[PDB]
Design a protein around this ligand. Structure first.
Ligand SMILES: *O[C@H]1[C@H](O)[C@@H](N)[C@@H](O[C@H]2[C@H](O[C@@H]3O[C@H](CO)[C@@H](O[C@H]4O[C@@H](CN)[C@@H](O)[C@H](O)[C@H]4N)[C@H]3O)[C@@H](O)[C@H](N)C[C@@H]2N)O[C@@H]1CO
Ligand SMILES: NC[C@@H]1O[C@H](O[C@H]2[C@@H](O)[C@H](O[C@@H]3[C@@H](O)[C@H](N)C[C@H](N)[C@H]3O[C@H]3O[C@H](CO)[C@@H](O)[C@H](O)[C@H]3N)O[C@@H]2CO)[C@H](N)[C@@H](O)[C@@H]1O
Ligand SMILES: [Mg+2]
Ligand SMILES: [Mg+2]
Ligand SMILES: [Mg+2]
Lengths: 113, 154, 68, 197, 96
RNA sequence: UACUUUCUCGUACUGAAAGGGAGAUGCAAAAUGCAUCUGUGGUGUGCACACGUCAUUUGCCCAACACCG
RNA sequence: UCGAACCACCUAGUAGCUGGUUCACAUCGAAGUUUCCCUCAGGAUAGCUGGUGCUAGUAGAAGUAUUGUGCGGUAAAGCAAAUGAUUAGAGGCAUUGGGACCUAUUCUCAAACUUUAAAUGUGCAAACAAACCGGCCUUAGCCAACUGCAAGGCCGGAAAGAAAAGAAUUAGAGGCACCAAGUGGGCCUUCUUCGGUAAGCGGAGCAGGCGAUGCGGAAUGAACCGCUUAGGGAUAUGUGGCGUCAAAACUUAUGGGCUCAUUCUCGAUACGUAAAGGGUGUUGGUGGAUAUCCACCGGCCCCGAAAAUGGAUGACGCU
RNA sequence: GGGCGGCAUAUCUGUUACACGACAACGCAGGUGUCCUAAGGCGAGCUCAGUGGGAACAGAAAUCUCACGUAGAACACAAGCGUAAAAGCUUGCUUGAUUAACGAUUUCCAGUACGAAUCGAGACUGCGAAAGCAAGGCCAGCGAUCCUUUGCGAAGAAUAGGAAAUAUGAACAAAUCAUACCAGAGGUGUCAGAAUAAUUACCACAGGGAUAACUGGCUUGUGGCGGCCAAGCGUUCAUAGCGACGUCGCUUUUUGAUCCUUCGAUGUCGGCUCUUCCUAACCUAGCGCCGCAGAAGACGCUAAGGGUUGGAUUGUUCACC
RNA sequence: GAGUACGACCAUACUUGAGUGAAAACACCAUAUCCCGUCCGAUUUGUGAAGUUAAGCACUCACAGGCUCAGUUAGUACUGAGGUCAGUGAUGACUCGGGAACCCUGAGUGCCGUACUC
């Protein structure tokens, strides 16, 4: 599905900006925003994931509960990037935007979060 | 294909492989098929008797019937919006036993190999480390990838 | 006059709206009618013993309740 | 902007209110919608949801059916406990074919005039759902029953009746009319009484 | 298609229940009798003024009819009808 | 409006017709076997409820489905 | 009033054909395909669709991967391997008659040829009605027999609920049923493809679209590009743009080259509707030779290049 | 478009068909309505097509013998598969080409019927020492209700309709007769199945641009007009003027092909009249070039400003004087 | 280290031409009264035991043909996804992946099972 997606390798600040600013949770089948770590601890019920730094831990360093944290959250809905996109219709190597960025995806997401 | 008979478009399909001709072998007769077993219907011309239809040639399903020279086998055929289960009946040369569950009976018997070394003894084969970790590279040979001029003259 | 003969265009998109309904499991509708008959008549002899064993086991489970 | 393709097909039909015009069913729906939310009992969940259901989906039970399944539970009941209160959301009819029955305590949505008599003549008791909300208000020591929906005429007509496997009944006011072609092997074919799956 | 005038077959009649000699005649249809039920109905429908009242088939396409052999057993003289395929010429002869 | 009586549909189907006509269990094997009459024909899956356990084990299984008798 | 008068009637004859069919909002939302039909402007049928639900809310889930294990003969390859074609030289010398024949090679091919053989696909399995491990009961199943085999139960055991090796993921409630609409003229497109000289032609395959749907862009365009649509704001984008029309480089750079064209007037937004050939116009390259020649190759520009209302990179214009 | 022609109307192998399966066209290449008492069934023995060496008459070919021979033969037939102590050939005995309790299934598919086929169980058998194989010749070769018609339901038992005797003609009974239930047959090739000749220019109705004749559109085979290459023509010589074999194209004043628009109507030829446009220039204005001495003229360039007739015949465009 | 009988995979086992072969066994070989079958005691059937490893069989050897297996061909041909890519077009490259085939070259030239025997 490469013509439809732009992927890459996140940093620690890309994870914690996405979890804090635009990270929400699937609580009672509803999309509620992370406001306190009590609401995270009430969601996962794992005694290893009790705060918002537990979720950026399991995401950034995979851990035993990468799936339960990411299936815990709603899909992140970002803004379009400020400053634009170069070409949607071509790969990143061809001079456009889709495909893999071997850690360059951080500056592209830093214009969206 | 201008005709809709039973063997139509089966020119290359019901043929035999090059220097693989002949009547079926004795290890096909001795291979005993049991009800409830996954078999693998592959139509064997040089028998020409009790062949499956051309649809059931790569297919593999469960035996439900064993008669003296016949095997019934339940094979899924998707029709419009549903996958109904066709119970065909072939001669016994047109089935092979299926090795589909070979990799599952292998890690099942590895789970009685383990649990027979944990509860009683202690001797285990070690767990395998991933090759995707970050090691150091000791270069025993280096080249230069450079696209020489003489690479074009061919 | 002449029209369009045969097409398979929309059909695969029509077939997946209510899904391709998958096959059903092997414990549903596993009728042995039409199977090889000497082994079918044998298995009836056995099920008529397994039913009267089930009538006797449940009756024996009641006397192990009225005494305890 | 969301790619929600098969998302209306995941929806189901629930119908939280009743279609009935009876003012006494609406009082039980006033009572059991209260108990369904204000109690952790799964009894009041099921008794509220089965009370909403239509009159076709509240198929009635027979008194000889209550007398057999209460027998097969009182077989493995310790005899220090009494017996459950049989509760059906629907009608109890009498059964001619079962003369003597034990003293059972039945809560139904309506009884016959004769099913009421044969319960109380056996030493039993016909209850009602306002009276079941007082003794066992959460359904402790009850036995919830339904009543049979197969065996109906309409269910016996559901099907094609001329494709193989189908033994449904044709819609025919004349019984000896649709009995010839496609129903006897001598009259060019007869639909196959059995088909696998 | 040559066919023998004798044929050894099963007879299934509990006086036989065994392979016995049959003899072969051929099936030729009997004369359509008046005072059959559908013939009396047809004579009642035709009488009057409407003309011809049932369809009368013209467009014959078969040039050939199926062969039915009546097989009378030697033991118990009981006919058994069997059918053979469509052939244009059929003959019974003992010559081989 | 109030009130009162055979006819019809249904409780039993099947066969072309003459016709025949469906409970369970136990003993048991009699070309109408005998005795009981508080009873799901049996097995798999299966709301509620009854007794334990953990952060479901089991009993009965209602409605239902499948496989049989 | 005549190739069958006029009047009343039967008669509001019948029409698979044409025309019409009267309020609002909301929730969902298609089909031009299958099979049969004196059927091809129509139906019945399955499908897509709505309504009603029912059943124990993750269950018997999947237009997807991964690992294991099967199926294939299309693209390519080959003719130095069979069959079908098809050029040409080499001599074998007795195997012959006015290249036959043989042996090794060769030039060139195959929708109805093939040794081999992809990519894309396609089947099954991947632990909760299940398989796994040690007795028992039953069977007029199998075998000489049972202690073996096959079958259906019963009893007890174990159970990373599936390890580690990249070792899945899911806006993943599963399974049933009733009732019934509209449709059954399609059309366009990337790719594969058939008939045709061709076609805005005819017919197919996989998918996506229009039909039925606007909106933002390509000046204009059912179908292209972007995006998909409750009533409104703010910010930021996408496709496409930034000399004026016309929002934006008040004609941006403190970037590089190339280009000159004199009566449908160089050129210039894809889809989208001029070639062979030529040039001592200019600007780069390559290989040879003695500051000058020679053979080649590319970029832009010119020639090749002729139609019927006045005319069109959208207009002005731009060098 | 319809008509003629045809069959793509029921159906079979190869290909189209895009390595599961499924896929269209009056797409390509051929078949089908029959044939067989053996050309079925089975057992035994054998090896085929062809070539090579040999043997009176006897040759390329008659028949004997030997060798090699993966099938190059054969299997009734179209084709494809398959096959060598065989599936072929010869021989020997045979009738499994019968019956087959309404078993189940596949292909076509609506998961209906039909046709064909597969895996069974039961009776009686055939061949074989046996294991086995055989209920046609694999795979195409065929057909509803209604009606006609045939076969089976031997007689002989039964104090009684049953475990066992086919049944009815309805107030009874006998004997005829008809009927019923079961399995076939006689047929519908338009092959899921009405019993069917034209004509209409005297014509009609409901419709259709789902569909033809006129224009327009697309295409440009065909018809008009060129360029490129240069074998040749021109006494000499490629090009003054031409230019085969090829080749690349322009043109929409022809015609074909299509079926987009119009069938609740776009008045369907040619003259006559009148105006304008285009250039691929016949005359006129400038020219270049010649196999251009002059005179006439060939070829070409810039140019469409202006001019481009009177008649005989023909309805004519055209043609022809 | 071999034989024989039954064998499983079915050429790494085949084809051609040489070479060698202890024992024992296979095998040619001898024969025609019975059993049996032929134009023919050839095959086949019976009954044998004088002879020979000539041949079969076995093994070994060929700049043998074949077969088998890697390698090369070759990241080549081809192909899945992409573009308001390039080119009048034919078609080509690029980008994210998958990835052949013959020729050619090297290797070696059967392997496993049961019973009986030397
Ligand atoms: O009974 C059958 C059922 O009718 C049929 N749909 C299917 O069930 C599927 C199931 O499909 C859903 O069934 C729902 C209704 O039956 C339907 O939901 C949608 O239906 C429309 C109207 N009926 C809409 O109004 C609405 O969008 C929505 N309710 C289907 O989504 C699937 O969800 C399951 N995955 C599989 C079932 N097989 O099959 C039944 C079997 O008889
Ligand atoms: N067999 C176990 C028991 O079956 C019961 O149900 C049994 C019967 O009550 C029930 O029979 C019903 C009958 O009640 C009702 N009046 C009519 C209905 N058609 C029958 O149903 C059954 O009978 C017909 C007979 O042909 C079958 O075709 C059908 O498949 C089957 N569902 O079906 C089962 C017969 O095998 C209950 N589910 C329960 O008490 C218990 O599980
Ligand atoms: Mg009834
Ligand atoms: Mg759109
Ligand atoms: Mg008749």
């Amino acid at each position: 599905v490469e013509p439809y997606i732009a992927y890459g390798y996140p940093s620690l600040a890309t994870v914690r900006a996405m979890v804090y600013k635009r990270g929400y949770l699937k609580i009672n089948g509803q999309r509620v925003k992370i406001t306190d770590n009590q609401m995270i601890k009430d969601k996962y019920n794992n005694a290893d994931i009790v705060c918002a730094e537990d979720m950026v831990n399991q995401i950034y360093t995979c851990g035993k509960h990468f799936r339960t944290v990411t299936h815990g959250m709603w899909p992140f809905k970002l803004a379009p990037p400020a400053g634009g996109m170069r070409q949607k219709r071509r790969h990143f190597v061809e001079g456009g935007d889709y495909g893999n960025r071997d850690t360059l995806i951080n500056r592209f997401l830093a214009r969206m979060i | 294909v201008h005709s809709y008979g039973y063997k139509s478009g089966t020119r290359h399909l019901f043929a035999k492989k090059f220097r693989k001709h002949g009547a079926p072998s004795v290890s096909t007769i001795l291979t005993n098929i049991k009800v409830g077993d996954y078999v693998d219907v592959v139509a064997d011309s040089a028998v020409r008797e009790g062949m499956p239809h051309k649809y059931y040639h790569g297919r593999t399903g469960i035996v439900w019937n064993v008669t003296p020279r016949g095997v019934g086998v339940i094979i899924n055929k998707p029709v419009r919006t549903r996958t109904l289960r066709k119970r065909i009946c072939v001669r016994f040369e047109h089935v092979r036993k299926s090795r589909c569950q070979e990799a599952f009976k292998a890690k099942e018997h590895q789970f009685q190999a383990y649990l027979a070394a944990k509860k009683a003894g202690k001797a285990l084969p070690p767990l395998k480390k991933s090759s995707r970790m970050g090691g150091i590279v000791r270069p025993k040979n280096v080249e230069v990838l450079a696209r020489r001029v003489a690479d074009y003259e061919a | 006059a002449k029209s369009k003969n045969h097409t398979n265009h929309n059909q695969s998109s029509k077939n997946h709206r209510n899904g391709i309904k998958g096959p059903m499991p092997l414990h549903l509708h596993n009728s042995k009618r039409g199977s090889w008959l000497p082994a079918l008549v044998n298995a009836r002899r056995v099920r008529k013993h397994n039913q009267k064993a089930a009538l006797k086991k449940r009756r024996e489970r009641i006397a192990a309740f009225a005494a305890k | 902007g969301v790619d929600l393709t098969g998302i209306s097909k995941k929806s189901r039909v629930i119908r939280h209110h009743t279609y009935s015009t009876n003012p006494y069913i609406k009082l039980l729906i006033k009572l059991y919608k209260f108990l369904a939310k204000r109690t952790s009992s799964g009894f009041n969940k099921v008794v509220y949801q089965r009370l909403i259901k239509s009159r076709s989906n509240r198929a009635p039970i027979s008194l000889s059916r209550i007398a057999v399944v209460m027998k097969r539970k009182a077989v493995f009941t310790a005899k220090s406990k009494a017996a459950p209160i049989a509760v059906v959301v629907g009608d109890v009819l009498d059964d001619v074919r079962m003369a003597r029955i034990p003293a059972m305590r039945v809560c139904a949505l309506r009884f016959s005039k004769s099913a009421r008599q044969s319960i109380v003549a056996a030493g039993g008791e016909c209850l009602t759902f306002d009276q079941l909300a007082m003794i066992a208000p959460t359904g402790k020591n009850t036995y919830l029953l339904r009543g049979r929906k197969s065996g109906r005429e309409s269910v016996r007509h559901f099907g094609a009746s001329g494709v193989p496997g189908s033994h449904s009944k044709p819609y025919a006011t004349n019984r000896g009319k649709e009995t010839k072609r496609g129903r006897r092997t001598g009259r060019s074919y007869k639909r196959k009484a059995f088909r696998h799956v | 298609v040559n066919y023998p005038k004798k044929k050894v077959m099963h007879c299934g009649d509990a006086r036989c229940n065994a392979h016995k000699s049959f003899k072969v005649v051929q099936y030729k249809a009997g004369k359509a009798r008046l005072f059959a039920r559908g013939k009396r109905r047809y004579d009642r429908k035709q009488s009057g003024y409407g003309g011809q009242t049932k369809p009368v088939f013209h467009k014959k396409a078969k040039t050939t009819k199926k062969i039915v052999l009546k097989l009378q057993c030697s033991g118990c003289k009981s006919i058994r009808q069997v059918v053979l395929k469509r052939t244009k010429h059929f003959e019974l002869n003992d010559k081989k």
